[PDB]
Amino acid sequence: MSKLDSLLKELPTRTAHLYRSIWHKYTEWLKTMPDDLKLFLSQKYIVKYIASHDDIAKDPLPTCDAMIWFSRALDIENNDVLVLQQRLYGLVKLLEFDYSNVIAILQKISINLWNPSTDSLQSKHFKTCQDKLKLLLDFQWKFNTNVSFEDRTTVSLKDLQCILDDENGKCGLAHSSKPNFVLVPNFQSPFTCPIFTMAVYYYLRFHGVKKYYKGDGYQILSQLEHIPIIRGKSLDQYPRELTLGNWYPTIFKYCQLPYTKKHWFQVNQEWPQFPDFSESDSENTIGIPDFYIEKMNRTKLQPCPQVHVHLFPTDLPPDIQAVFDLLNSVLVTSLPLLYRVFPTHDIFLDPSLKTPQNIAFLTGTLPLDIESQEHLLAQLIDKTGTVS
DNA sequence: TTAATTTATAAAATT
DNA sequence: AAATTTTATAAATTA
């Protein structure tokens, strides 16, 4: 702006210049989009700019400081500008983070919690595979979305929204409500995938296993107002905090990894987070740029694979159906693998899975070659009847 | 050492 | 009809 130039006299020459140039860059880029003052600065455009440029992406900070300046150095609300600052700093934490460290805690756990026979475990809970899976989903979930526990219990799965876009090749489970997040299937590593986890767990929870464990029935998805992502004693409520708090060290112990409760029960700040915002498109999903989602779920975005087998119901309320079809595709896609690793798993005990066909497809082509998951398997402390 | 936050123990209430 | 989440309560670890 004409009246903008004078406000950089007021700055040290060098950091007035650096800004001048950042600006030229940003608006000379902005000539690249359809579209006269403050509107030019919106989180959307600044974030797009920063992430879309490697040169900038590697060293975002001077840029961010420039932007917070130009912003507050224009007429923009104080609380507002500071929320912008919040988003930017979040973005940098996101870009700079190396998951390569934390990852093996995920791996090391997920596997062991899938393993149907845990001998070294004399601890009371975790008798079934549904207990193991319940915990594992809570863990994989925090790990991927980095969310508060309390908030974890706030989310009603009727709130959840399936994302299926085959135009851009995306699929996942989104929540645009109070906690803001997006989950995506890892087809490269089903075990460390929270959605596959949720699929098995949900089959066990709902269908149940005939003659062993009562399913809850698929009927209650109507009569109930709040369907919790994982159920405690009561159908309609998330398990209590101290309960999980017991379940956790129990597993970390057996896995021999150090345990800090604050990490899993509260937001972890050294860790990346989704922004907050008060149905998708090419570059974003719910409110969120895709690089957030691919980074935090640590998997490339892929279209939902079409399966011809239905383990989940094809008759439901329209709201939940899409969700359950996603679950169906992940489950059915990755099940032959689970069968080749842990054929002793509770899921396989259902007479349904015993049919001549379901046996047919469990024993058919493998979703990926065995030699892929070796390293993963090397991470469990009870070797099964099948050693490879 | 306190505060407060993590765990370990004792009736109890569902499932 | 048994057992383990839940209440509840007290002990104890961390800063």
The position carrying tokens 């040290």 is A12
Euclidean distance between CA atoms A201 and A132, whole angstroms: 9
Euclidean distance between CA atoms A301 and A155, whole angstroms: 24
The nucleotide closest to A126 (CA, C1' atoms): C4
Euclidean distance between CA atoms A182 and A290, whole angstroms: 10
Euclidean distance between CA atoms A378 and A24, whole angstroms: 53
Residue A262 beta carbon within 7 A of nucleic strand B: yes
Q: Are A215 and A205 in contact (CB under 8 A)?
A: yes
Experimental method: X-ray
Structural domains of chain A in order of their starting residue, each with its CATH number:
1-99 (1.10.150.540), 100-387 (1.10.443.20)
Burial class from Cβ neighbours inside 10 Å (0-12, 13-18, 19+) for residue A232 reads middle
Strand C bases near protein CB (under 7 Å) are 4-9
User: Residue A172: beta bridge partners?
Assistant: A163
Could you tell me which of A184, A199, A376 has the C-alpha nearest to residue A296?
Answer: A184
Phi-psi domain of A55 (left: phi exceeds 0; alpha: psi -120 through 50; beta: other): alpha
Residue A232 beta carbon within 7 A of nucleic strand C: yes
Instruction: Round to a whole number and report the distance in Å from the CA of A265 to the C1' of C13.
Output: 18
Euclidean distance between CA atoms A39 and A42, whole angstroms: 6
Euclidean distance between CA atoms A84 and A68, whole angstroms: 7
Q: In sequence order, which residues have a C-beta less than 8 Å from that of residue A232 and are 6 or more positions away?
A: A238, A239, A240, A243
Euclidean distance between CA atoms A82 and A79, whole angstroms: 5
The nucleotide closest to A259 (CA, C1' atoms): B6
- In this complex, the residue with its CA at the shortest distance from the C1' of nucleotide B15 is A233
Give the Å distances, CA to CA, from A28 to A8, A23, A25, A346, A359. 19, 8, 5, 60, 61
Euclidean distance between CA atoms A309 and A304, whole angstroms: 14
